[PDB]
Amino acid sequence: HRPTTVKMIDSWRTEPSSEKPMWYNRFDQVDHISQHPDPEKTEKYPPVDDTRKLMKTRGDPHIMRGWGEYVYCHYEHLREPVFPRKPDVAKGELAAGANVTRTDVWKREGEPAIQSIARFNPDNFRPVGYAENIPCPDTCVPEGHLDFRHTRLPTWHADRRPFHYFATGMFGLIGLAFLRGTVVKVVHGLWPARDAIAAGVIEVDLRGIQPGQNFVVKWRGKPVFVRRRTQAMIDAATADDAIVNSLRDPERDKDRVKKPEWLVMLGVCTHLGCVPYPDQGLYGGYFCPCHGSHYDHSGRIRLGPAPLNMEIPTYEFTDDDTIILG
Amino acid sequence: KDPPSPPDWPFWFKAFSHCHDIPSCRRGYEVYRQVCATCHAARFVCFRHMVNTIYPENRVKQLAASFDYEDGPNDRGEMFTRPGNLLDPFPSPYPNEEAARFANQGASPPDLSQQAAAHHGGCDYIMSLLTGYRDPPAGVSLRSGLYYNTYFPGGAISMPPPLNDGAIEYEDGTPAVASQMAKDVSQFLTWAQDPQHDERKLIGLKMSTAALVWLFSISVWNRHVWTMIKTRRIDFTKTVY
Amino acid sequence: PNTKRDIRRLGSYPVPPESKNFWRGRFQVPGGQIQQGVSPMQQKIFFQWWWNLPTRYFWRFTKWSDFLIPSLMWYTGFLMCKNDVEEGTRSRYWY
Amino acid sequence: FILIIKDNIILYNINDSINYLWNIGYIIMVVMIVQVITGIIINLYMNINNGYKGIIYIIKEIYYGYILRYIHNNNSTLIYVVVYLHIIRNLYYKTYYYNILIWYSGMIMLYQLIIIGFIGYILGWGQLSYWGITVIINLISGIPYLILLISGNYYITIVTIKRLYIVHFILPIILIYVEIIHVYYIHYLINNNIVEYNVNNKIIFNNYILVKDNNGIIFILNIFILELNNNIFIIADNDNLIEINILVTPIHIIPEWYYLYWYSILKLLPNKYSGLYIVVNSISIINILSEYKIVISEYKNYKNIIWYNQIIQYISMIYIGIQLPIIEYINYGRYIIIFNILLLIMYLYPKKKK
Amino acid sequence: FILIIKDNIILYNINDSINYLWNIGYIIMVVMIVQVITGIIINLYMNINNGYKGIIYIIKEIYYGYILRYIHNNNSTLIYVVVYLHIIRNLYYKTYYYNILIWYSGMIMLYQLIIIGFIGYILGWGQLSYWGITVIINLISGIPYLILLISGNYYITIVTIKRLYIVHFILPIILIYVEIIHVYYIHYLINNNIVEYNVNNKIIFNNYILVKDNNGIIFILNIFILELNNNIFIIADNDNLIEINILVTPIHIIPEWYYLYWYSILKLLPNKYSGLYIVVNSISIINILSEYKIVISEYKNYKNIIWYNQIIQYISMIYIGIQLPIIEYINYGRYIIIFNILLLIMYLYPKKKK
């Protein structure tokens, strides 16, 4: 058995069962178990029609005393003494356990001891009235209770499988819809947040700029040079537009500017990331002072260590005097 | 001894399928900008929160551009000043709490970003507090700068009665009276606390109704399978077919 | 598991590893029994709820009425304390 | 482990006669998973340097971040409601009488949950959060230098928040492990039934009990979704949305509703240590309710008068916690404490024989 | 679970003829526990809003916080050294020939470890950390809108750090679970021996193998303590102590030493995607080395020429990664890649018959 414990102790305040039985101590004793009456063939008490007419019970409501929660039971775990009280079997008291072995109640006068002790087998004691009280169920479903014989559908009924699978299908249908909504919503939270999406769009008010002026906008962490180009600057890049293929990174000004008057570029030197300064260099474009890279008026590398042209960001013209970076 | 509990005002948004009343929210912001903003700050409310929810984008740009924000550093390491934009929070009247206390006789006007839900009674507390300014109870004398409000804990608040009839002119033409302004600002501050309030309830409506249909399906399934069990007949000395 | 007598198996076929718990709840049925049932697909699946409805609630309420006296006494205590609190506050503070 | 799943879900036998009160345990297991999942997701966005500004950021800026914020707060309330109802259920049927190992495994999860919920409340970083932990930590000021080691400073700061956050992240995972010891003992030590005795009417779990358990958990979900989206019950005190001020106390300093019972015990007893010890008594004393009995009976299915008085006693103590520290409430609360002690003694004491 | 421990530690039988190369696995398990423990403790003090200032705070202000900082960094180097040596060991004896399930369970832990180590490197929040993740994430720029979802912004920020931190906190715990599947398969599918065949010379683990394993792990500890306190080997690049500047790149952008092999593969191949695919090839191709063989033999205990060339090939590729992108290095590196492909084909191909 699993780890288990019983309260088989010698109490300081509660007597053992041999000393004070808590059950109704009237039993009938036979010589052989076959001499007991048969409950199934024994007439029971006459049925009553009112709950107030039901018979009385032999139990004593006040069998136990003292502080504690109320309880009615017949048995305890306490240990018995080696010299237990001698039971009065003549009056009907039960003799089983220590009160038989460690006493001389079993002794008759002239009967062979083997026969005398045979009678006090526990199978020979049954409570008075066992055969007239103990229920003998013939079924777990008493008469008047609903069962399959009353709920069976008529034989002309319609198939119930189709609707059953519709109901279990609907449980799955709704469950899958709730599952998809949950998953998508959680993944959606990883998208750039409302503050970040908002900050990732800067609008350039081309209103107030003067031809030849270069301004810087911090867009997505990087400097974005936005320069209005004078006709001289525009013509200069157009002149190099013919000498294309003589440049480290051949690109035409038309493919780097959406409007000739406006050059929007990311101001990050393609060599080692330094930010170039405008109106500097040999081409009057943008000169990175770190290692000496010269870019033209279109942002194309013309001299220095830098390998490529300054990148053109993603930007569109909302109107004639506004750009939207992103 | 706990502060008097506010009454239950019948705001539109209290019902299960009701939204924030946008026209009232618009009027509420006007009250906050022109009355409450002088002493209080809304640190966690940004102009972009109002775009396409309370006001159109162009209008919110004008509101933000009205204020000036210290920004920087520039290339010379100096801090400059610029007009506001959609990314800025609502302006703060004072640079720090010590400055606020000094200008308000040692009382600190709390930030109103979450005050709509920070008191027992919630939105009702704001509406009741603004309209809860009565003459002092007989036998109670208040030191100068303290006023009697039935709902403020203790009864004496360092806030002057902020709402007076005709204080502002509503753009929509609604009559400007103290009770109207209290109702509107209470509405607006409730929105500011949880701008996703309408989204929560609309999605909740779909979930709750769907959950009822889901309950019916599992109930039919539960009834079906347990019929096998609850109608069985176990016999011992009897047999019926 | 059940008692040793109950779970003592008659067959010598080994207990499958996926039915260990199932066979620890075995019972040794004395005297035999006849079990009968019908598939739910051929039965009324909601009528039993309606048939048993009134008796179910009658027996539920009569059992719960045992707690009537205790609950009234606790409620009587709730009222005394609430109004003992009001009188105390007024006596100590109100004029 | 597909043969272990099949032995504990598919071919697991349970009595047919159980009520819906036997579905509570399943609900605890499911909502517990949700609380762990939503916590992990919330930490993808949360700021531990300022919990006050993190919650605002999640509610306003994160897409559907309000769902995560409110589910985590409201589902914690549901975790305690369901767990406490499970405790009341176990007390009513006296399931601890023979399945004490199940009761012991459960109590460990109760002890862990108490710590988990409290620290999480602190992570909000509002007025009540700061002042609640300040008050509770002072209870151990008797032990020298213990407060300094725990707080990491001379006052509660972000230093304390950082370390408590790790306990809040990890302890719930350990709680899930203890749930496996709880289920192991339930499956080995068979569950109790509505009747006292053991009867031969068991049916497999997956086809019958799981369908009934889903019906119950979907019914509780219909209620939880209403609270989640509309706040039909006030289950979070509003004072925790006020920014912390270490010089000014809030109007009242109280924990969540599910700690009110223990909060009132401290507020009632005059000596601080006695209050702490009575708190220890209530949770520990219910672990030995049946240990002194000597009769062959589990005291099951009587009128359960003592049980009902105890449940109402918890409710009344919770009610007293909400009220201000009025003298009259203190007197009545003390009577309730004395009354509770007598009820427990009734449980413990064995009976003599007439 | 004391009878499961007794069946897998006390009465677990292993051959007597194994070398100290069979002690590597035990070392991995122990150092893995240490890395998890020191990580949890470090997070009691770490600041995720600025990883750069958190490390300084731990090293200077926390009592014995330098031990936590250096153990976690240096023990990660030891985790990869021991794991790679274990991989080399398995390749040499061709333990994958019959114990493929053990090889598969191990490779999963290898894949997880790669992710764990890389994200942790980012948590330092230095120049190399910022620029390393920026470069690697651009490899998946082909998949639309995937970079934005992962980074949470248009550039790497604290938003990215917060989410990567959760993966770094949780994934190592999952790795420990996979270690149980690895040990389950080792105990069921018996280990290989230095000889090809299976022989009757096994002895219990606790009294003999564990003593020998402790001797090995204590010998490795004498070496790890010297590195831990005195930095006898440069295992962390100094460039990660520079504050992040998003406009200026560092002198070189390289990962830790244990990622150099894969770093060079990308730097060598001209097309970016081809570089990624060759990285995929190297780890996956070694999972099917024995699948096409048809003879009754495990190719064990020959002169292992192909093996030795492969190990040196890993070392040379690691060497090329350190060097600048010089054209001459690119040419030689490409030859090594071609050479490596031929070696793998030698492993895979079955033999015809003369």
Ligand SMILES: CCCCCCCCCCCCCCCCCC(=O)OC[C@H](COP(=O)([O-])OCC(O)COP(=O)([O-])OC[C@@H](COC(=O)CCCCCCCCCCCCCCCCC)OC(=O)CCCCCCCCCCCCCCCCC)OC(=O)CCCCCCCCCCCCCCCCC
């Ligand atoms: C300056 C101050 C300094 C203070 C210094 C204090 C130092 C104290 C040192 C203490 C050292 C530790 C002692 C631990 C002992 C552990 C023993 C144990 O585990 O045994 C298990 C052992 C297991 O035995 P078993 O064989 O397995 O089972 C036995 C069977 O069940 C059946 O056995 P049986 O049938 O043979 O029966 C034997 C009988 C034997 O029983 C006895 O002999 C015990 C009698 C105890 C009586 C206590 C009465 C106190 C009344 C105070 C009145 C104050 C009046 C003030 C007047 C003021 C006027 C102005 O037992 C019973 O009848 C049932 C016992 C039930 C025990 C329940 C245990 C509950 C413990 C917790 C209670 C308190 C918590 C709630 C309240 C907290 C807040 C207030 O149990 C026993 O053998 C029985 C022992 C029972 C001991 C109970 C002792 C309770 C003492 C309470 C003290 C209260 C003090 C109040 C002071 C107020 C002043 C105003």
Ligand SMILES: CCCCCCCCCCCCCCCCCC(=O)OC[C@H](COP(=O)([O-])OCC(O)COP(=O)([O-])OC[C@@H](COC(=O)CCCCCCCCCCCCCCCCC)OC(=O)CCCCCCCCCCCCCCCCC)OC(=O)CCCCCCCCCCCCCCCCC
């Ligand atoms: C462990 C414990 C448990 C843990 C759980 C986890 C907990 C975690 C913590 C919690 C975390 C926080 C988050 C919690 C969130 C909780 C709440 C939540 O999730 O809420 C979600 C969600 C909340 O709402 P919501 O998400 O805002 O709503 C979203 C929208 O509703 C709908 O969404 P939407 O608007 O985004 O998308 C709509 C769109 C979505 O659109 C689609 O997806 C449709 C498109 C799919 C296309 C599929 C194509 C597949 C085939 C591809 C091709 C294959 C070729 C293969 C060839 C192979 C060859 C070898 O669909 C439509 O627009 C509909 C029309 C679609 C037309 C499709 C036409 C297809 C044409 C195809 C033509 C092809 C021809 C080709 C020919 C040429 C070939 C060469 O919940 C619900 O809505 C609940 C709904 C429940 C069900 C309601 C229905 C009840 C029905 C009752 C029936 C019974 C009554 C019967 C009455 C009968 C009267 C007689």
Ligand SMILES: CCCCCCCCCCCCCCCCCC(=O)OC[C@H](COP(=O)([O-])OCC[N+](C)(C)C)OC(=O)CCCCCCCCCCCCCCCCC
């Ligand atoms: C406020 C809190 C949030 C509330 C809203 C969100 C809640 C989300 C809850 C999701 C529940 C999903 C349940 C789906 C059920 C579908 C199957 C079903 O029951 O159908 C009935 C049917 C049963 O019907 P049947 O048994 O009658 O089938 C008979 C079969 N025929 C008709 C062919 C004869 O089940 C199936 O079809 C079989 C599927 C079994 C499923 C077992 C495993 C479940 C795994 C669930 C996946 C969870 C994923 C989690 C991912 C999370 C990521 C973040």
Ligand SMILES: COC1=C(OC)C(=O)C(C/C=C(\C)CC/C=C(/C)CC/C=C(\C)CC/C=C(\C)CC/C=C(\C)CC/C=C(/C)CC/C=C(\C)CCC=C(C)C)=C(C)C1=O
């Ligand atoms: C130690 O761990 C444990 C806990 O945590 C500490 C528990 O909470 C619990 C119990 C948990 C619960 C009962 C669930 C959560 C409990 C609560 C109280 C949260 C909700 C809060 C409340 C209901 C507070 C309001 C309380 C009150 C108004 C009670 C005060 C009034 C009282 C007592 C008078 C009412 C008396 C009653 C007997 C109630 C019913 C009365 C009636 C039906 C009749 C009314 C009378 C008439 C004449 C009509 C247990 C078992 C536990 O073990």
Ligand SMILES: COC1=C(OC)C(=O)C(C/C=C(\C)CC/C=C(\C)CC/C=C(\C)CC/C=C(\C)CC/C=C(\C)CC/C=C(\C)CC/C=C(\C)CCC=C(C)C)=C(C)C1=O
């Ligand atoms: C002031 O107002 C009041 C409140 O509001 C403020 C109240 O809430 C309350 C009631 C509050 C409560 C009853 C709970 C209060 C909770 C507090 C103070 C929590 C404080 C934080 C902690 C205890 C965190 C430390 C964590 C632990 C000790 C772990 C707890 C769990 C335990 C011990 C169970 C078993 C142990 C574990 C699970 C630990 C496992 C250990 C490991 C895995 C270590 C492994 C190590 C190795 C080397 C292998 C009152 C009374 C009140 O008055």
Ligand SMILES: COC1=C(OC)C(=O)C(C/C=C(\C)CC/C=C(\C)CC/C=C(\C)CC/C=C(\C)CC/C=C(\C)CC/C=C(\C)CC/C=C(\C)CCC=C(C)C)=C(C)C1=O
């Ligand atoms: C640029 O310079 C370079 C470097 O330095 C910068 C390099 O390091 C390198 C080499 C670097 C590498 C080889 C590694 C790079 C690592 C990176 C980019 C890691 C990025 C972060 C992630 C992948 C985190 C996401 C995490 C995952 C997908 C989990 C990973 C583990 C997996 C998939 C194994 C099995 C799955 C799991 C363990 C997940 C478990 C899932 C659950 C428990 C979910 C449960 C959910 C429910 C609902 C129950 C190169 C080539 C280089 O060029």
Ligand code: HEC
């Ligand atoms: C415009 C109509 C408003 C609104 C809606 C509120 N106020 Fe004030 N307020 C001021 C000060 C000094 C305080 C501190 C509290 C006190 O004085 O002791 C407050 C407080 C508030 C609250 C919180 C009340 C409490 O519980 O603390 C609220 C909700 C509130 N106010 C709303 C000062 C001023 C002003 C300076 C003259 C003005 C103007 C306003 N408040 C205006 C408003």
Ligand code: HEM
């Ligand atoms: C039984 C499990 C848990 C319960 C009872 C619980 C409880 C709570 C509580 C009550 C809150 C604060 C509510 C509020 O802000 O007012 C909270 C916050 C938080 N919890 Fe949990 N939690 C649990 C598990 C977890 C887990 C597993 C994680 C992480 C993996 C987590 C992470 C967080 C975080 C980040 C916060 C701060 C967000 C906040 O302000 O709510 N929690 N927790």
Ligand code: HEM
């Ligand atoms: C994390 C919290 C816990 C969870 C996950 C949980 C889960 C479970 C589940 C699934 C069952 C089996 C089905 C059921 O009876 O409903 C159960 C049974 C039980 N639990 Fe818990 N439990 C928790 C807390 C507790 C606590 C705190 C106690 C004790 C105070 C407890 C005591 C019991 C008992 C006695 C049973 C036996 C039920 C019976 O015999 O019928 N549980 N629990």
Ligand code: HEM
């Ligand atoms: C195989 C397991 C793991 C390995 C390979 C690993 C690797 C590393 C690496 C290389 C670092 C950065 C080293 C440096 O700063 O230069 C790091 C940092 C960190 N790791 Fe881990 N880690 C692992 C497990 C964990 C775990 C389980 C946790 C937490 C429970 C954790 C928490 C941290 C934290 C907070 C940091 C930041 C401190 C730092 O700057 O070093 N790690 N990790």
Ligand code: HEM
């Ligand atoms: C977290 C990393 C891992 C740990 C904890 C670990 C641990 C172990 C241990 C304890 C053993 C048994 C004793 C030994 O042979 O030394 C072993 C065996 C083995 N491992 Fe791993 N391992 C890891 C990684 C790997 C990887 C990545 C592979 C495959 C590429 C692998 C393949 C094997 C093989 C084939 C064996 C069989 C050894 C034999 O047959 O003699 N392991 N491992």
Ligand code: FES
């Ligand atoms: S970074 Fe510009 S010249 Fe080198």
